[PDB]
Amino acid sequence: GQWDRLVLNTPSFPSNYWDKFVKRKVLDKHGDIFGRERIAELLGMDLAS
Amino acid sequence: CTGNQQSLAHSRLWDAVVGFLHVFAHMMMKLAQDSSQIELLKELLDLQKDMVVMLLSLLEGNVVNGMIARQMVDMLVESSSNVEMILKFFDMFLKLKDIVGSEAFQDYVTDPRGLISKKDFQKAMDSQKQFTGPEIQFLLSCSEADENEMINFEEFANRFQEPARDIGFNVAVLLTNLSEHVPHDPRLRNFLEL
Numbered sequence: 656g657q658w659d660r661l662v663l664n665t666p667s668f669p670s671n672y673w674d675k676f677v678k679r680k681v682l683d684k685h686g687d688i689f690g691r692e693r694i695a696e697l698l699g700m701d702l703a704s
Numbered sequence: 705c706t707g708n709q710q711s712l713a714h715s716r717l718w719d720a721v722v723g724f725l726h727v728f729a730h731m732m733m734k735l736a737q738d739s740s741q742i743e744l745l746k747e748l749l750d751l752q753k754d755m756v757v758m759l760l761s762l763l764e765g766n767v768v769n770g771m772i773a774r775q776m777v778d779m780l781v782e783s784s785s786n787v788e789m790i791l792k793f794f795d796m797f798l799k800l801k802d803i804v805g806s807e808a809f810q811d812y813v814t815d816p817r818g819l820i821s822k823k824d825f826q827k828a829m830d831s832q833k834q835f836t837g838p839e840i841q842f843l844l845s846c847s848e849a850d851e852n853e854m855i856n857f858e859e860f861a862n863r864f865q866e867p868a869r870d871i872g873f874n875v876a877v878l879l880t881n882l883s884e885h886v887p888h889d890p891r892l893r894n895f896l897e898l
């Protein structure tokens with residue numbers, strides 16, 4: 656659970672995984688109680704928000 | 705004392721509690737919009753604890769889908785508005801305990817003293833989903849002020865907690881229990897959801 660804190664930001668995180676949208680279902684969920692511009696980093700999508 | 709239990713069921717008692725539920729809602733709502741009369745609110749909640757507990761006594765020793773439990777949910781159908789109001793009073797002040805403390809919020813508070821301002825508070829609870837507009841207007845009321853920017857966020861949150869550590873507990877027991885002795889019943893379900 657640490658070697659894998661490297662991919663989260665990567666721009667191909669959902670590579671071999673069907674849902675190429677995961678990064679956008681977490682911004683939509685934990686996106687209020689936590690800054691919409693704070694979870695807009697540890698999930699890549701930098702400025703993509 | 706089952707012989708005694710039926711006497712209260714066939715008695716002019718329900719029209720008394722439904723009236724109590726009505727008056728309990730407004731003063732519980734009115735009193736919170738002030739800082740000096742807060743002392744009276746504490747013993748008002750104690751009356752709620754000594755009122756719901758007797759409803760448990762009626763319900764103890766009851767059979768499933770019994771006749772006593774039918775009037776319990778039936779009386780709520782007419783005395784609904786009042787009930788719901790109470791349940792809300794709890795949620796509101798239990799969701800704030802979380803909000804204040806959520807990283808997000810602590811990003812709106814910008815001051816050394818340790819106090820947020822009215823504008824900010826509004827933006828915060830509003831930036832965050834839920835907390836419908838009129839409720840935000842109310843919350844910026846039960847709050848204090850001091851230069852309108854000394855709403856010491858902390859206290860507020862952990863203020864009306866202890867006083868109701870119970871009440872909220874003894875309505876949770878009320879909704880759950882009936883929700884076991886009077887199983888199949890839509891009316892109640894709704895309440896449990898709120």
Ligand SMILES: Cn1c(=O)c2c(ncn2C)n(C)c1=O
Pocket residue numbers: 673674
């Ligand atoms: C898009 N998608 C899915 O939504 C899915 C799946 N397997 C299960 N689900 C739900 N696969 C392989 C998939 O490609």
